[PDB]
Amino acid sequence: MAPERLRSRALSAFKLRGLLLRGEAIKYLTEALQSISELELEDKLEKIINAVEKQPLSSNMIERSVVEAAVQESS
DSSP, rough: HHHHHHHHHHHHHHHHOOOOOOOOHHHHHHHHHTSSSTTTHHHHHHHHHHTTTOOOEEEEEEEEEHHHHHHHHHO
């Protein structure tokens, strides 16, 4: 369990909801979730997605500025 596997797990959680995630944004939450339990990573990141779903946006492409505020509700 390392960032190179975390990235694939984390991108898939946004893809399952119909979103896409920027390279600066995937890195941001990859560092924020670096030590989270491998079987809880999806349930944890789902709290970020639930915050993105109530933030102002205009595309399915999520960005670092959106995640940097969505993580605050997941904390």
